[PDB]
């Protein structure tokens, strides 16, 4: 599989904090998805299930008509060595657990994924799920790894046009749904495709430390946003708290050519210090 | 007393008020904490260890106090933070149906490690003799139990004792305080503590549309001027008290 990449023009703008704002222009410093970035286009037809590294956040999505895309698995070892944070989910049920497993060799789905048991430290099995002609259901999923929370902001939207598979051009925020306070070092990531042989296409982005300018509506929702590290016009609209700059020359930042090596020049004497004489002394003094 | 269960509690709202609702004649001695200031510190995981210790040996259940039951069945270092309850139940425990229902161990070849169980199947060894798994001289079952007949004094009745251990590690905001309520008053400058926010202002209940998840209501001046009612969902508007400047 030679996985291609699509564009992510304006997608992945979640609510950083929990504060009602009305007609404001805030500038938050959190882990968002950069505008017009490269997002992998893993296609499931004949099917893919990689071990993509969960660095500091991923922007999961799905564009299909069925519900074969349901479930996630997190962890660093995934071989019953360390804990896990699977997000197994199905029709009107959520099987999110913390117990560690070895699955079999690779997840696929019935509880045919995992064949082991251990001490589970959470019981958030709570029922409420996280899930026309060509009204396809796009379901974004932002996962983070904050000190004590998982930050699982997600949402759902319908798309109309039956054009070739591609992220639509339209702003959409991601309201929080579940905030299970489980802390575990997560490095790996895996999606749980429903086998059901008796197809789809999930996108997997990556978050980076950025700086955005979120505009809130009178109703209290984020209608649009502009990055501050994409184009000079964006940095100009960021330094001045506005979305429509006027005619003129504006100061935005200062170029500073960054390094490219770290030279360490210490003396070339090589011996052993006589600390044994002073510290490990036979007779001390007064 | 040697085979004790260890229950692991998760995120919840623990109310330390039903502990003193059972039958009378129960102790509430704590170690490092107090029942009046119990719902003030935040703990991640609380472990309950149940055991059937009884008699004049509950007083020596403390860090740095060796006895005859806490020497090879349960050891606690000098860091225990919790309260021990030893209420008596002499109605459904002491029965004539069976006297060997509860067990009791004896001295071992070495001291037990604190917070570790000693499930063992072998027979005690005197040190130098062939045991061969038989009941002979210097080779006997160290699980010497006692009977339970509803005729002895107070010092021999079954005492249901359970300890609680409070740990503090790198964990999110776990169980801390059962709850609180003060029956808020509207349209009057008074102190408020709505979900952490310890501010002073007036409630006016503005008609602003909060999102299902949005709790706070800060403004373009970085000042919280709207909060969601915790118990009965409603959007308030915390406006500061009346103030100004006098001129003579």
């Amino acid at each position: 599989l030679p996985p291609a990449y699509t564009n992510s023009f304006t997608r992945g703008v979640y609510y950083p904090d929990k504060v009602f704002r009305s007609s404001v222009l805030h500038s938050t410093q959190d882990l968002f998805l950069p505008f017009f970035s490269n997002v992998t286009w893993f296609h499931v037809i004949r099917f893919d299930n990689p071990v993509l590294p969960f660095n500091d956040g991923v922007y999961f999505a799905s564009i299909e008509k069925s519900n074969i895309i349901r479930g996630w698995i997190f962890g660093t070892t995934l071989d019953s060595k360390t804990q896990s944070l699977l997000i197994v989910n199905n029709a009107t049920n959520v099987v999110i657990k913390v117990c560690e497993f070895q699955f079999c060799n690779d997840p696929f789905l019935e509880f045919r994924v995992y064949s082991s048991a251990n001490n589970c430290t959470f019981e958030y099995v709570s029922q409420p799920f996280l899930m026309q002609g060509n009204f396809k259901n796009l379901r974004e999923f932002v996962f983070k790894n904050i000190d004590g929370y998982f930050k699982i902001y997600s949402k759902h939207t319908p798309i109309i046009v039956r054009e070739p598979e591609d992220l639509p051009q339209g702003f959409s925020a991601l309201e929080p749904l579940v905030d299970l306070p489980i802390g575990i070092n997560i490095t790996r990531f895996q999606t749980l495709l429903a086998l059901h042989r008796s197809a789809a296409a999930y996108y997997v982005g990556y978050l980076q430390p950025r700086t955005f300018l979120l505009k809130y509506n009178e109703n209290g929702t984020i209608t649009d946003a502009v990055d501050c590290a994409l184009d000079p016009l964006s940095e100009t609209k960021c330094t001045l708290k506005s979305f429509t700059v006027e005619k003129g020359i504006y100061q935005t930042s200062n170029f500073r050519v960054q390094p490219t090596e770290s030279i360490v020049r210490f003396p070339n004497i090589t011996n052993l210090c006589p600390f044994d004489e002073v510290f490990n002394a036979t007779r001390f003094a007064s | 007393v040697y085979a004790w269960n260890r229950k692991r509690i998760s995120n919840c709202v623990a109310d330390y008020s039903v502990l003193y609702n059972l039958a009378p004649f129960f102790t509430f001695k704590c170690y490092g904490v107090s029942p009046t200031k119990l719902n003030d510190l935040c703990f991640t995981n609380v472990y309950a260890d149940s055991f059937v210790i009884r008699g004049d040996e509950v007083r020596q259940i403390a860090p740095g106090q060796t006895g005859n039951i806490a020497d090879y069945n349960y050891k606690l270092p000098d860091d225990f933070t919790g309260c021990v309850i030893a209420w008596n139940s002499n109605k459904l425990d002491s029965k004539v149906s069976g006297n060997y229902n509860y067990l009791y161990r004896l001295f071992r070849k070495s001291n037990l490690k604190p917070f570790e169980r000693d499930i063992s199947t072998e027979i005690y060894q005197a040190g130098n003799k062939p045991c061969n798994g038989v009941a002979g001289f210097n080779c006997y079952f160290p699980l010497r139990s006692y009977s339970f007949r509803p005729t002895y004094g107070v010092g021999h009745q079954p005492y249901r004792v359970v300890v609680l251990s409070f740990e503090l590690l790198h964990a999110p905001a776990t169980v801390c305080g059962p709850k609180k309520s003060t029956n808020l008053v509207k349209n009057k400058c008074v102190n408020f503590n709505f979900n952490g926010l310890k501010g002073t202002g007036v409630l006016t209940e503005s008609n602003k549309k909060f999102l299902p998840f949005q709790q706070f209501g800060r403004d373009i001046a970085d000042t919280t001027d709207a909060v969601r009612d915790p118990q009965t969902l409603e959007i308030l508007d915390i406006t500061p008290c009346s103030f100004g400047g006098v001129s003579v």
Epitope: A117, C120 | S50
Partner: antibody
């Protein structure tokens, strides 16, 4: 689903000691009671002992008191049984049965088996 | 406690059988039943005379009347020949009193 693996059993001399183990797999080892009940060949069954969801002994028979010791391990999820002073009338298939109900706090004492195993031929001769 | 069970009950596969377990004052305590096939593992059948487990058809039923617990099997076939056991709690002794099962042979 439920896999109650039973281990421990063989030919031992009368008067020796042994340890049988029953490991659970498939369900949670925190809210289900597990009992040991022998079964003589062609002569019915006979309940030996049992333990509730927590570390608790329910009792024994009129001929096994003081000789057998049952224990539970929620860390390893296993029920162990140590036998002492075995005689000629202890040759039976010891089965490890589970419980159906969740054993809520306030109820009546009524335990019944829901799942069965295979048993281990523990012969004493 | 002590339960009395019939040594062997035979009946043609055209009608129902009568497997009874009675005691001294067993009128309110729960009565459970089990069915063990020769060679295989036992299984649960209608217990408490008021409910059945998942998988047991409507053919099995239980009825307690005063001092007799009857296990009625409907449309007995050749595949139902097994050993039926009845279990009582008897909280007075803190035990589990079993009894000699009946070898139902069609």
């Amino acid at each position: 689903e439920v896999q109650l693996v039973e281990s421990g059993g063989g030919l031992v001399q009368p008067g020796r000691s042994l340890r049988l183990s029953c490991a659970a797999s498939g369900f949670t080892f925190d809210d289900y009671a597990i009992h040991w009940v022998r079964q003589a060949p062609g002569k019915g069954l006979e309940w030996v002992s049992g333990i509730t969801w927590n570390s608790g002994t329910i009792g024994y028979a009129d001929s096994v008191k003081g000789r057998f010791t049952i224990s539970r391990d929620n860390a390893k999820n296993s029920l162990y049984l140590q036998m002492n002073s075995l005689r000629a009338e202890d040759t039976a298939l010891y089965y490890c049965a589970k419980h159906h109900q969740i054993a809520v706090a306030g109820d009546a004492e009524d335990y019944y088996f829901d799942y069965w195993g295979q048993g281990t031929l523990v012969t004493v001769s | 406690y002590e339960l009395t069970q019939p040594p062997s009950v035979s009946v043609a596969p055209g009608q129902t059988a009568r497997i009874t377990c009675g005691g001294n004052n067993i009128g309110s305590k729960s009565v459970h039943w089990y069915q063990q096939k020769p060679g295989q593992a036992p299984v649960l059948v209608v217990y408490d005379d008021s409910d059945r487990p998942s998988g047991i058809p409507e053919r099995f039923s239980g009825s307690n009347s005063g001092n007799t617990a009857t296990l009625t099997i409907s449309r007995v076939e050749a595949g139902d020949e097994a050993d039926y056991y009845c279990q009582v709690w008897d909280s007075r002794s803190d035990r589990v009193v079993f009894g000699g099962g009946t070898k139902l042979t069609a």
